[PDB]
Design an enzyme around this catalytic site. Structure first.
Site, PDB file in Angstrom:
ATOM      1  N   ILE A   1      59.780  68.987  85.545  1.00  0.00           N
ATOM      2  CA  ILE A   1      60.898  69.058  86.540  1.00  0.00           C
ATOM      3  C   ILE A   1      62.133  69.661  85.883  1.00  0.00           C
ATOM      4  O   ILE A   1      63.077  70.060  86.644  1.00  0.00           O
ATOM      5  CB  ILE A   1      61.187  67.739  87.241  1.00  0.00           C
ATOM      6  CG1 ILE A   1      61.681  66.651  86.300  1.00  0.00           C
ATOM      7  CG2 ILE A   1      59.983  67.326  88.063  1.00  0.00           C
ATOM      8  CD1 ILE A   1      62.529  65.635  87.011  1.00  0.00           C
TER       9      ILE A   1
ATOM     10  N   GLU B   1      54.861  58.214  74.408  1.00  0.00           N
ATOM     11  CA  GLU B   1      54.964  59.643  74.008  1.00  0.00           C
ATOM     12  C   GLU B   1      53.952  60.457  74.816  1.00  0.00           C
ATOM     13  O   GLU B   1      53.811  61.655  74.542  1.00  0.00           O
ATOM     14  CB  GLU B   1      54.779  59.857  72.507  1.00  0.00           C
ATOM     15  CG  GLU B   1      55.737  58.980  71.678  1.00  0.00           C
ATOM     16  CD  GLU B   1      57.213  59.259  71.959  1.00  0.00           C
ATOM     17  OE1 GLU B   1      57.567  60.455  72.051  1.00  0.00           O
ATOM     18  OE2 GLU B   1      57.978  58.287  72.130  1.00  0.00           O
TER      19      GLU B   1
ATOM     20  N   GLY C   1      52.850  59.669  82.694  1.00  0.00           N
ATOM     21  CA  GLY C   1      52.732  59.254  81.292  1.00  0.00           C
ATOM     22  C   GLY C   1      53.884  58.343  80.935  1.00  0.00           C
ATOM     23  O   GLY C   1      54.992  58.555  81.482  1.00  0.00           O
TER      24      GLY C   1
ATOM     25  N   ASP D   1      66.390  77.873 104.561  1.00  0.00           N
ATOM     26  CA  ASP D   1      67.463  76.832 104.532  1.00  0.00           C
ATOM     27  C   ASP D   1      67.427  76.006 103.228  1.00  0.00           C
ATOM     28  O   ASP D   1      68.343  75.210 102.989  1.00  0.00           O
ATOM     29  CB  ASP D   1      67.347  75.883 105.728  1.00  0.00           C
ATOM     30  CG  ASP D   1      66.795  76.561 106.968  1.00  0.00           C
ATOM     31  OD1 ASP D   1      65.665  77.108 106.881  1.00  0.00           O
ATOM     32  OD2 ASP D   1      67.497  76.555 107.988  1.00  0.00           O
TER      33      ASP D   1
ATOM     34  N   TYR E   1      49.769  66.697  85.774  1.00  0.00           N
ATOM     35  CA  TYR E   1      50.426  65.853  84.747  1.00  0.00           C
ATOM     36  C   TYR E   1      51.874  66.332  84.586  1.00  0.00           C
ATOM     37  O   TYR E   1      52.156  67.559  84.460  1.00  0.00           O
ATOM     38  CB  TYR E   1      49.685  65.912  83.406  1.00  0.00           C
ATOM     39  CG  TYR E   1      50.329  65.146  82.274  1.00  0.00           C
ATOM     40  CD1 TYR E   1      50.713  63.840  82.436  1.00  0.00           C
ATOM     41  CD2 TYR E   1      50.528  65.740  81.035  1.00  0.00           C
ATOM     42  CE1 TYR E   1      51.265  63.144  81.367  1.00  0.00           C
ATOM     43  CE2 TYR E   1      51.074  65.060  79.969  1.00  0.00           C
ATOM     44  CZ  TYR E   1      51.469  63.757  80.152  1.00  0.00           C
ATOM     45  OH  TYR E   1      51.980  63.023  79.091  1.00  0.00           O
TER      46      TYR E   1
ATOM     47  N   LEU F   1      62.432  62.081  79.720  1.00  0.00           N
ATOM     48  CA  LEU F   1      62.653  60.818  80.444  1.00  0.00           C
ATOM     49  C   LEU F   1      61.766  59.759  79.854  1.00  0.00           C
ATOM     50  O   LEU F   1      60.801  60.105  79.142  1.00  0.00           O
ATOM     51  CB  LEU F   1      62.407  61.024  81.930  1.00  0.00           C
ATOM     52  CG  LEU F   1      63.211  62.166  82.545  1.00  0.00           C
ATOM     53  CD1 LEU F   1      62.842  62.318  84.004  1.00  0.00           C
ATOM     54  CD2 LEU F   1      64.693  61.991  82.361  1.00  0.00           C
TER      55      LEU F   1
ATOM     56  N   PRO G   1      57.485  67.374  79.819  1.00  0.00           N
ATOM     57  CA  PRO G   1      58.390  68.402  79.360  1.00  0.00           C
ATOM     58  C   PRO G   1      57.693  69.652  78.819  1.00  0.00           C
ATOM     59  O   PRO G   1      58.337  70.703  78.758  1.00  0.00           O
ATOM     60  CB  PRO G   1      59.213  67.741  78.251  1.00  0.00           C
ATOM     61  CG  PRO G   1      58.870  66.314  78.248  1.00  0.00           C
ATOM     62  CD  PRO G   1      57.507  66.187  78.946  1.00  0.00           C
TER      63      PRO G   1
ATOM     64  N   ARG H   1      59.427  67.860 101.999  1.00  0.00           N
ATOM     65  CA  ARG H   1      60.357  68.622 102.824  1.00  0.00           C
ATOM     66  C   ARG H   1      59.650  69.829 103.444  1.00  0.00           C
ATOM     67  O   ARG H   1      60.142  70.250 104.463  1.00  0.00           O
ATOM     68  CB  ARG H   1      61.541  69.113 101.994  1.00  0.00           C
ATOM     69  CG  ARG H   1      62.416  67.984 101.517  1.00  0.00           C
ATOM     70  CD  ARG H   1      63.695  68.458 100.903  1.00  0.00           C
ATOM     71  NE  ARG H   1      64.599  69.194 101.761  1.00  0.00           N
ATOM     72  CZ  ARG H   1      64.699  70.518 101.835  1.00  0.00           C
ATOM     73  NH1 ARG H   1      63.867  71.291 101.190  1.00  0.00           N
ATOM     74  NH2 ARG H   1      65.594  71.066 102.632  1.00  0.00           N
TER      75      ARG H   1
ATOM     76  N   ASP I   1      64.097  70.759  81.592  1.00  0.00           N
ATOM     77  CA  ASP I   1      64.089  70.723  80.108  1.00  0.00           C
ATOM     78  C   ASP I   1      64.880  69.522  79.648  1.00  0.00           C
ATOM     79  O   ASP I   1      65.909  69.696  78.947  1.00  0.00           O
ATOM     80  CB  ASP I   1      64.592  72.036  79.513  1.00  0.00           C
ATOM     81  CG  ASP I   1      63.634  73.195  79.707  1.00  0.00           C
ATOM     82  OD1 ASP I   1      62.409  73.008  79.684  1.00  0.00           O
ATOM     83  OD2 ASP I   1      64.116  74.309  79.876  1.00  0.00           O
TER      84      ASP I   1
HETATM   85  N1  LIG Z   1      55.739  63.660  74.159  1.00  0.00           N
HETATM   86  C1  LIG Z   1      55.357  64.340  75.442  1.00  0.00           C
HETATM   87  C2  LIG Z   1      55.770  63.489  76.644  1.00  0.00           C
HETATM   88  C3  LIG Z   1      55.038  63.481  77.811  1.00  0.00           C
HETATM   89  C4  LIG Z   1      55.401  62.665  78.878  1.00  0.00           C
HETATM   90  C5  LIG Z   1      56.577  61.918  78.812  1.00  0.00           C
HETATM   91  C6  LIG Z   1      57.050  61.079  79.987  1.00  0.00           C
HETATM   92  N2  LIG Z   1      58.365  61.479  80.424  1.00  0.00           N
HETATM   93  C7  LIG Z   1      58.653  62.653  81.005  1.00  0.00           C
HETATM   94  C8  LIG Z   1      57.707  63.345  81.782  1.00  0.00           C
HETATM   95  C9  LIG Z   1      58.112  64.509  82.394  1.00  0.00           C
HETATM   96  C10 LIG Z   1      59.380  65.003  82.188  1.00  0.00           C
HETATM   97  C11 LIG Z   1      59.779  66.286  82.825  1.00  0.00           C
HETATM   98  N3  LIG Z   1      60.823  66.927  82.343  1.00  0.00           N
HETATM   99  O1  LIG Z   1      59.148  66.690  83.819  1.00  0.00           O
HETATM  100  C12 LIG Z   1      60.266  64.237  81.441  1.00  0.00           C
HETATM  101  N4  LIG Z   1      59.929  63.103  80.808  1.00  0.00           N
HETATM  102  C13 LIG Z   1      57.342  61.980  77.674  1.00  0.00           C
HETATM  103  C14 LIG Z   1      56.917  62.721  76.584  1.00  0.00           C
END
Ligand SMILES: NCc1ccc(CNc2ccc(C(N)=O)cn2)cc1
Ligand SMILES: NCc1ccc(CNc2ccc(C(N)=O)cn2)cc1
EC number: 2.1.1.228
Lengths: 248, 248
Positions: free
Chosen positions: B143, B126, B123, B172, B96, B148, B99, B164, B145
């Site tokens: 991925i 929220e 996801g 490299d 999954y 998205l 953030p 990759r 802090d």
């Molecule tokens: N409220 C928690 C939550 C969970 C999932 C999301 C969907 N967007 C995402 C997912 C992963 C990342 C990341 N940095 O890897 C960034 N944004 C948003 C909020």
């Protein structure tokens, strides 16, 4: 340019890419797709391929000193950048996405989102000539300490992250500098796991404090370095201490 | 399944997404597009929308305890996950992207790339019910802090980074744990900036040492914390000291 949706803070993003069709993933779908259709966000692509003059439309070139990989050919890439800058007019900051760049975090997203115009340069192969960084690029940024086949996914990541800070795009991002709390939806019981009763209580203040305590506990257990960047409120110091006592 | 391209280490990636068309950005273009066409990489998407039963195909649901945002509806998402796991068979680890996850870096990319099968859960809103993390998700990864509009760009970022490391995908990566050195291509002079003569010399060993010294100097000036994670070779200790003396 027309419509009814308030767009005072609208952003323009120019993109230099050998694969502009990749950008459909953000411009045709979801919240970013809606931002584009409502004129809160404009994404405009130039392809160095269209700036070539040879019969085979060559966009790569050999690095000086040898080694395995290719670089983006200077003339087509430089010409695409100049055309994007002329289109953008004054105030467009030019960003190059690379693993050698400044590490993007949410604070950096909000700094970037202050720009009404960005140009995002997407490198393929082993990237671009050092002298173009010096002469054409305002800021170099990384989305993270990994290497991708191109800057397009990093560019799309930055566009999406900045777009969320454009008023009207959304319908609370690392609230308080903390990891977000757990969330629950239907059903009340799932594989024997029950929704915390506090969330069912209707008590807005006890719910607020439970979510803040959970966020403090999860940040402490998973990403304790994130706590060091913070001056916690009185209420936050007390809830962390309670979660740390309950853990122990 | 057929073809001539050696594919011993081929990867299968299942994806759960409300916007599977986003994945065309990686499956139809560039190096990842070639990996898919050559059967080194397979990306297979399930859309929770296809697992709904109501007339309006509802894929979101209200969080318990209120607050502004929606969550992914449990039943359609859970059913899509179960169908991907049945398709994948034994050994598929379910990731999954959030953030709140483990921070992805190149070392984590190479750990993830050891899996012959992944399922990536994307996801929206929220995010997903906490109990699905507990019951369906093997590992949570970020991925970076920032926040998205969905997990699709993070999922595509991880696919590209892992691809990759699949033998045959490249033609490299943070060589030595360091930031990459500057590269140069034609022309020899650009806006009065000349290619370092060493790169023109043909002296493979002096070129190697210049690139290593530049990488050490750039890591030291931009990302000194990256040096602390390393036990530098004798040769690297000497080149850093020379670059630090020349800087001063
Ligand atoms: N409220 C928690 C939550 C969970 C999932 C999301 C969907 N967007 C995402 C997912 C992963 C990342 C990341 N940095 O890897 C960034 N944004 C948003 C909020
Ligand atoms: N050799 C330097 C170089 C420069 C550019 C590329 C293109 N791919 C990218 C760009 C940005 C990021 C990132 N983490 O933001 C990752 N991969 C590759 C190599």
């Amino acid at each position: 340019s027309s419509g009814l949706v308030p767009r005072g803070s609208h952003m323009w993003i120019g993109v230099i890419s050998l694969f502009p069709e990749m950008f459909k993933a953000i411009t045709e779908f979801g919240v970013t797709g809606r931002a584009v259709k409502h004129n809160l966000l404009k994404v405009e692509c130039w392809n160095p391929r269209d700036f070539t003059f040879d019969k085979h439309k060559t966009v790569d070139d050999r690095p000086y000193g040898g080694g395995p990989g290719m670089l983006m050919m200077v003339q087509p890439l430089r010409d695409a950048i100049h055309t994007a800058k002329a289109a953008a007019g004054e105030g467009a900051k030019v960003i190059y996405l690379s693993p050698q760049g400044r590490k993007l975090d949410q604070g950096g997203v909000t700094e970037l989102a202050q720009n009404q115009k960005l140009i995002l340069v997407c490198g393929r192969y082993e990237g671009i000539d050092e002298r173009l960084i010096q002469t054409e690029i305002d800021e170099e940024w990384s989305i993270g300490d990994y290497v991708l086949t191109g800057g397009e996914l990093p560019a799309m990541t930055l566009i999406d992250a900045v777009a969320r800070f454009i008023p009207g795009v959304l319908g609370d991002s690392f609230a308080d500098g903390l990891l977000d709390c757990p969330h629950y939806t239907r059903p009340e019981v799932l594989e024997g796991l029950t929704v915390p009763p506090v969330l069912m209580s209707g008590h807005h203040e006890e719910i607020r404090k439970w979510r803040l305590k959970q966020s403090l506990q999860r940040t402490w257990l998973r990403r304790p370095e994130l706590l060091e960047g913070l001056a916690l409120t009185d209420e936050q110091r007390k809830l962390l201490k309670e979660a740390q006592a309950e853990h122990n």
